[PDB]
Write a protein that binds this ligand. Sequence first.
Ligand SMILES: CCCCCCCCCCCCCCCCCC(=O)OC[C@H](COP(=O)([O-])OCC(O)COP(=O)([O-])OC[C@@H](COC(=O)CCCCCCCCCCCCCCCCC)OC(=O)CCCCCCCCCCCCCCCCC)OC(=O)CCCCCCCCCCCCCCCCC
Ligand SMILES: CCCCCCCCCCCCCCCCCC(=O)OC[C@H](COP(=O)([O-])OCC(O)COP(=O)([O-])OC[C@@H](COC(=O)CCCCCCCCCCCCCCCCC)OC(=O)CCCCCCCCCCCCCCCCC)OC(=O)CCCCCCCCCCCCCCCCC
Ligand SMILES: CCCCCCCCCCCCCCCCCC(=O)OC[C@H](COP(=O)([O-])OCC(O)COP(=O)([O-])OC[C@@H](COC(=O)CCCCCCCCCCCCCCCCC)OC(=O)CCCCCCCCCCCCCCCCC)OC(=O)CCCCCCCCCCCCCCCCC
Ligand SMILES: CCCCCCCCCCCCCCCCCCCC(=O)O[C@H](COC(=O)CCCCCCCCCCCCCC)COP(=O)(O)OCCN
Ligand SMILES: CCCCCCCCCCCCCCCCCCCC(=O)O[C@H](COC(=O)CCCCCCCCCCCCCC)COP(=O)(O)OCCN
Ligand SMILES: CCCCCCCCCCCCCCCCCCCC(=O)O[C@H](COC(=O)CCCCCCCCCCCCCC)COP(=O)(O)OCCN
Ligand SMILES: CCCCCCCCCCCCCCCCCCCC(=O)O[C@H](COC(=O)CCCCCCCCCCCCCC)COP(=O)(O)OCCN
Lengths: 147, 82, 155, 438, 77, 111, 80, 205, 97
Amino acid sequence: SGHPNGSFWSEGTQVGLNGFKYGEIPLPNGQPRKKLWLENIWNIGYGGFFLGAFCLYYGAPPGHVIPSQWATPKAKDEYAVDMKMIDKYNERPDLQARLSIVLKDLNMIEEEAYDLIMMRKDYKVLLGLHSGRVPADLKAIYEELEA
Amino acid sequence: DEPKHQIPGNALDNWAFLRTYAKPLPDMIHYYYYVYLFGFFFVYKVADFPEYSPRVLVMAALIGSLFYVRRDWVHREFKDSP
Amino acid sequence: TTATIEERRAFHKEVLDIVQSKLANKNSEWARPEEPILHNLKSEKEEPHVYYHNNNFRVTRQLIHFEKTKIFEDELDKCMRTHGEAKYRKCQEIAKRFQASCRVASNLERGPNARKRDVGFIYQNNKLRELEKDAKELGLNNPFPPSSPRTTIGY
Amino acid sequence: MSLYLFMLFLQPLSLSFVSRSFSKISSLMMSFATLWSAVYMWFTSNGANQTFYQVVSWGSDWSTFGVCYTSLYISLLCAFIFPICVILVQGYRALSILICIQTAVSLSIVSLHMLAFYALFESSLLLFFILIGRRKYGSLSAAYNISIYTFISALGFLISAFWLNWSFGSVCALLPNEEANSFVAFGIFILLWVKAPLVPFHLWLPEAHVYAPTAGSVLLAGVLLKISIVGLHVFFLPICASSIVKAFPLILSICLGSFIFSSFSTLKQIDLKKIVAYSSISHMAIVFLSSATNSGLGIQGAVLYCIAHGLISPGLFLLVGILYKNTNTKLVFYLRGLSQQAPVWWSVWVFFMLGNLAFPLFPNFIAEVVCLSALFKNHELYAYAFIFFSFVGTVYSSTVLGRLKGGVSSQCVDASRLDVISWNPLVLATVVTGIGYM
Amino acid sequence: NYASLKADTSMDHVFGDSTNKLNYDFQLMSSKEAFFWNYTLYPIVGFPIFLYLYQFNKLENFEAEIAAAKAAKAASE
Amino acid sequence: SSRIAGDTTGKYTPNIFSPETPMDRSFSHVPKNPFWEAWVFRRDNIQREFVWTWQTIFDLATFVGGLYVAMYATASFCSRQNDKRNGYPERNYYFSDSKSNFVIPDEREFY
Amino acid sequence: GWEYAGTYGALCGMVYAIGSNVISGRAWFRRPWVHVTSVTLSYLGSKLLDEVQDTYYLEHLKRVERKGLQVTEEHKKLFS
Amino acid sequence: TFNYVIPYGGSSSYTINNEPVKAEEVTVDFSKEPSASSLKLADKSDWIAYTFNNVPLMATVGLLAGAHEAFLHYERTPIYGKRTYNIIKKLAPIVINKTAYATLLGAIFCATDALYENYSGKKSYTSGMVAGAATGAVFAIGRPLPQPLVWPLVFAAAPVIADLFGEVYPESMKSARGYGTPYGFENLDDAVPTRNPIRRNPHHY
Amino acid sequence: VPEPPYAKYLANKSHYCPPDFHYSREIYAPYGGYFNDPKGWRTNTAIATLVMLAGAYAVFCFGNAREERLRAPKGWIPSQLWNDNVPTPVDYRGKVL
Ligand SMILES: CCCCCCCCCCCCCCCCCC(=O)OC[C@H](COP(=O)([O-])OCC(O)COP(=O)([O-])OC[C@@H](COC(=O)CCCCCCCCCCCCCCCCC)OC(=O)CCCCCCCCCCCCCCCCC)OC(=O)CCCCCCCCCCCCCCCCC
Ligand SMILES: CCCCCCCCCCCCCCCCCC(=O)OC[C@H](COP(=O)([O-])OCC(O)COP(=O)([O-])OC[C@@H](COC(=O)CCCCCCCCCCCCCCCCC)OC(=O)CCCCCCCCCCCCCCCCC)OC(=O)CCCCCCCCCCCCCCCCC
Ligand SMILES: CCCCCCCCCCCCCCCCCC(=O)OC[C@H](COP(=O)([O-])OCC(O)COP(=O)([O-])OC[C@@H](COC(=O)CCCCCCCCCCCCCCCCC)OC(=O)CCCCCCCCCCCCCCCCC)OC(=O)CCCCCCCCCCCCCCCCC
Ligand SMILES: CCCCCCCCCCCCCCCCCCCC(=O)O[C@H](COC(=O)CCCCCCCCCCCCCC)COP(=O)(O)OCCN
Ligand SMILES: CCCCCCCCCCCCCCCCCCCC(=O)O[C@H](COC(=O)CCCCCCCCCCCCCC)COP(=O)(O)OCCN
Ligand SMILES: CCCCCCCCCCCCCCCCCCCC(=O)O[C@H](COC(=O)CCCCCCCCCCCCCC)COP(=O)(O)OCCN
Ligand SMILES: CCCCCCCCCCCCCCCCCCCC(=O)O[C@H](COC(=O)CCCCCCCCCCCCCC)COP(=O)(O)OCCN
């Protein structure tokens, strides 16, 4: 037992092929194996697919392939506005009372105050105010907080 | 040799049962004549029938389908006896 | 609220005019509208142009909401990581805002069968407050816990 | 879009003019050209056009074709998976049948007219009867099953399409129409009920898959089952949402029952192909339920899971075909010692089976997470039911792997160079989707 | 063609004979036993369902009692 | 008694007349068993031994129908809870007899 | 009516020539004269069919107008 | 919607209603209303009367089936050979028994349907299901094991099929027109008819 | 039985292989054979170690760019030697270092 020459750092005792890969027998004189008919077509077509997918995913401008990428700057701007507005809301208790009235008519709980602030420009609020479902007080409240 | 489905019954008994279909065969014209005649009269009468509920019609169709006997069935079982 | 056929055809003609005005100048952001087409239709499907434009506006808005929620989550995570053990007191507000954003994004277009997403247990807490008020005023005994000051890091 | 449709029409056309000896080479080159055209269609699809990326009409409502999120993913999946089917099939007759089936299926996905959709999908009805019922390796029973089930479901869908064309005056998806009728909803639904196997209308699928050639099985599981999700998203949810919401308790009952009964039935299977077929039936239930919730999370999750299945099931069917070629057996009891005898086949088999069990580094995990989230959005119990019963898939897969993994075997049955070439694209695609490039 | 049905008796002395066979009849559980165990195990599996049903019932009953009392207080007064 | 059929160089020919058996793909096929083949046949063709007996009807109804009933009842309960949670009026489901026409919530309306 | 009737007809004539060759066991390229004749005849027949369809569309528009359908100018434009 | 972000379909307001607008200026109906005979037969008020009005149909079907079987037996019997037995004595039971069984089953179905509808007081699917089930139970009195389950089901299903596609279907899809403008969508600019199309004259056969 | 001609190409039994143990030498596995010990292993291992160190360098670069420390360490941390984004240490009392 032990190592072959007693030293761990000695040349391996096996010379040859550990196994036959794909079951192919090495040519005696070292002649290369003839390539299969499909190898070139397969490699070109699939490599072209994967490379095209890579280039489209990364090369394309924002919002062409991934729609969320386009929305990121706009979300930052709305985040800034919302943050300023919420800060103003916390300070002024008169506005809070008016919104508590607006919320009740809209079948919303008091905690959903921040939610109303965050939906200033959304299908439900925009079309409800026009149609009459949403009380017109909300428009003034939003303007008081710089829209 | 391969696995095969088991056939219920003995060979000679099954063949004997099959041989009960080998009987004098009437011509189909005799049946057709009566069916054509009565069918024509039936179509004439049907115009005067009262309007029946869809449920009753469907039930009548079911009963007729259940009570219909295939021509082969009578042929195999027919016996010229009392 | 009733809509007469005369008014319906009038709105249809106005919608056609809006389409014609949009068609006059090319816009690469035609399907990312910043404003909806306001209407009082019983069904949006009646006016196809309004339906498609408003749907595109709703998609734009929802994408914006999703990105806003991701931004809110990033500030909450930074705030939580900076404060240390004082996170519970100092990060109540940021968390409140993040949870509000999550509710707005999920609830706006939940779907016909989806339930409201109660981020922060606000609805449950409200229900428990109402149940407590009723039990106390009517002299009943409540089998439910009383409402909580804080149920989550924020809401 | 126009390039993709033209390449699609050229692929069946090319066969008529080939030398009859160059058929396989020409077919492979055409398949790769169709894949490249699909990539071009993806490149020319701007996300800015939120509703439909591209719509083309060639003179009539029937010839209206267009690509949406569901359509784009399914079309890319079909173009990706077709080359594998092509190389696996030999003979002009087989090539002709396969190329006609593929052209019909790929044209159906992009069609935006219900009547045109029906015309294109059901054109490949006799071709499947002939393919599944081939002389030596086919079963007439399976052919009759699949054909009759398809005809009855598609005829119901056709009747609903005729009523919608009579009542509204058009049956094109691009025209907004809503219907509250339950007969019409049922007519459209029955097609989806049969095509995407749902208990008790799933019997046609396993028979067809077992007696179909490997190219046929790969195409069937990979994309034929997905054609249901295109019909749901494009031809059912826009018009018959009210009926899906009205029948949601029944839809949920039938989908969960399908998932449970199919899982239990998979436990009694001794044939590898039947195991893979019943796994597909179980997997289809989550996709169907998630789409029926009519939520953003559900539609996206269903499409994503469909892609994951369309990448994992062809792999298992390909490996099973390779093993059957090497051994002429599909009985798990005869196949033993595959770990020692086929270390390379075994590695890929284990990887694909892990993918089928929705492990984290596989696309199935992400897809399942999204679908479960959509169910949890509907109700917590809905999600819990599906999550709990997932163990049954583990029991059957573990038992199969254990039986195959060890024992005594005297035959070296490992994959050749051709077999590794055929699965390499599927492996790479699985890995890429697993890491999050969905 | 087919594999040989003749066994190998080389290792019979070392590892024992194959004469002893299994006593199992290879049949499954009785129908009566199965009904009991399915209708016992499945409810255990669906523990969340019963928790939700319990809480929902309690909530609805409380709400109905509250409404009843409210009505009573709103009638006289 | 055996020879290598495959040739990497591409000069592959099938020696159909060779006395020695080619080591082709058929070399590695597993030997079948008369009894295993009959078991496989019996398992697939199990519809022949199907018999309608009270035990069979009982087992089918109790597990298949029983699961379907439990699943429907659970789904109906979950729908009722969601309707109560959302604040929507009782929805007109297919088998539910409700004197209300509510089905799809209005997106514009605030519930 | 259809703006692609001529192209369709030419391609269909090709379909006839190739199909007839294939059914009889000959190759697609055989009998070249058949190809030109088929293409021309099918193109002309497709065009003629399109005029016939248009003519009966206009006859129908006349009939419906006589019956009392209040077709607008745009509707009268739909039927060339 | 054809997008992955918002739910597909749409929502219609329940508050907002659209005033009905006539399909055409003048409506000419070529569909005749139900006859007084149809209403009389359909009246289930008195179960005995209902049963006696509707049995003629079952009796006719039984007579046709019995005539069929009797003819099949008669055709085979040979004219050339003299027969000891009387043919009518052999054939008359066939026809009589078939007619009697058919009439009895139809009587059971009609009676149970009328009695359930009266006791319940409402026209419902259940009445047909219970009438079918009772008829199928009577059909399978002495039959082997599967038949007691199968016949009550098939028979109960038949009135369900009749109700769904004979009564509910037409009333459900009465509004759809096919000409002019789609029923729901009248805002759209489609040619408006002065009169409805009359594709056929009211039938008289 | 006369070993087949290809058997010359295949490798012998390694030193670690038990003499009684018989394995088929034709089977290929990516993880290696039954007992391995190939010739040229020392070079392969040196190449492996070099690829490991290069990948460690790339991983270190990536981590350093993405390692965000938002709260000051209580005392000096080793990361300061290599990363410049460490907040100045503050002790338990609060004094800056
Ligand atoms: C004195 C002269 C003798 C004649 C007497 C009267 C003379 C005629 C006078 C007036 C005739 C006009 C009206 C009579 C019926 C019209 C048929 C006809 O005339 O065709 C010529 C016909 C011969 O024509 P043929 O082309 O030479 O023979 C073709 C067959 O292949 C023949 O070959 P075969 O017999 O060997 O094969 C029979 C085959 C032929 O197939 C048919 O019979 C097809 C008919 C099916 C329905 C027909 C349409 C129903 C619509 C009726 C409309 C009214 C209701 C309205 C609404 C209903 C909605 C459906 O069917 C079968 O296999 C046997 C099964 C019976 C029906 C199968 C359906 C079973 C469904 C039940 C489900 C329960 C099973 C569940 C459990 C299963 C377990 C898995 O002559 C007759 O048969 C007349 C005999 C009269 C007996 C009819 C019994 C009741 C009549 C009304 C009931 C309606 C149902 C029809 C049932 C059977 C009718 C054949
Ligand atoms: C699509 C939507 C659907 C909606 C509506 C659809 C529409 C519905 C209806 C549409 C129907 C479409 C499907 C039905 C297709 C009709 C069936 C069919 O294809 O033919 C059947 C029939 C089947 O022939 P088969 O299979 O051999 O069996 C018949 C047996 O031979 C039996 O033998 P046989 O005893 O019966 O012999 C009688 C007959 C049958 O005999 C034969 O067929 C033997 C072969 C005829 C001689 C070869 C034709 C010579 C030129 C043809 C050009 C081929 C170009 C290809 C190679 C280029 C060479 C440079 O002989 C004839 O050919 C009678 C016609 C007289 C013309 C003969 C040639 C005259 C000298 C050339 C004229 C002008 C030269 C200009 C340029 C020349 C070179 C380019 O074909 C013909 O009969 C050929 C008819 C005419 C021959 C070609 C003449 C074309 C004019 C030269 C090209 C110049 C451009 C053309 C435009 C201007 C015209 C002047
Ligand atoms: C202008 C510049 C020039 C540029 C070129 C542009 C020209 C454009 C088009 C021109 C191309 C030539 C057209 C080919 C005509 C002959 C094709 C043929 O015979 O097929 C087999 C034939 C193979 O011949 P073969 O191997 O030598 O032996 C056949 C022996 O004759 C008999 O062998 P067997 O007795 O052993 O039969 C065994 C049979 C096994 O038995 C079966 O399976 C029978 C099944 C019945 C039909 C299959 C039902 C499903 C077919 C779906 C359609 C496939 C497309 C799917 C797309 C959806 C479209 C809605 O298996 C097969 O035959 C092949 C299986 C799949 C082929 C079925 C597709 C052919 C449909 C109809 C062929 C057209 C014949 C018209 C006849 C004209 C005058 C006689 O051709 C092929 O290479 C495969 C089919 C190519 C299909 C393209 C044809 C268009 C049909 C699509 C319909 C769309 C409307 C047409 C508009 C087309 C563009 C305007
Ligand atoms: C107002 C009407 C009232 C109701 C009246 C109903 C009366 C009958 C209605 C039944 C209509 C269904 C049509 C399918 C019949 C079953 C298939 C025939 C059975 C059969 O033996 O077919 C063999 C193979 O079929 C197969 O292998 C197919 C297996 C079974 C097919 C499953 C059916 C599809 C799904 C069923 C419903 C799905 C949704 C329903 C909306 C081929 O026989 P052969 O070629 O050797 O001929 C030799 C003669 N024996
Ligand atoms: C027993 C469980 C039900 C099995 C179905 C499970 C899941 C299927 C759900 C599919 C989703 C959309 C389909 C819409 C309705 C189909 C079935 C809904 C349940 C149902 O039958 O409701 C009936 C109404 O539906 C109808 O009136 C139509 C029923 C379907 C017709 C059957 C065949 C139609 C084929 C027509 C082909 C195309 C025709 C196009 C013109 C009666 O319920 P109810 O409201 O009266 O309540 C009174 C109870 N007390
Ligand atoms: C011939 C064919 C059929 C013959 C044999 C059928 C025998 C099966 C009969 C019992 C089957 C299970 C029991 C479920 C139905 C019980 C009675 C139905 C009436 C009902 O809805 O009551 C609800 C049952 O609780 C529930 O909501 C469901 C509780 C049981 C579900 C969990 C039990 C097993 C869990 C396994 C997973 C299955 C579900 C996975 C999601 C609670 O009353 P309510 O408050 O809702 O008021 C609603 C007004 N009645
Ligand atoms: C093709 C439809 C044929 C039915 C197939 C069912 C399976 C056949 C087994 C035979 C059983 C007999 C038929 C029973 C089916 C009816 C469903 C039972 C539900 C039920 O009892 O509720 C009734 C209404 O359902 C109804 O009566 C309307 C429900 C419509 C039936 C289901 C429609 C879709 C089924 C199709 C599934 C797959 C198609 C393949 C066959 C009561 O209502 P009520 O008003 O009386 O209230 C009571 C006030 N007294």
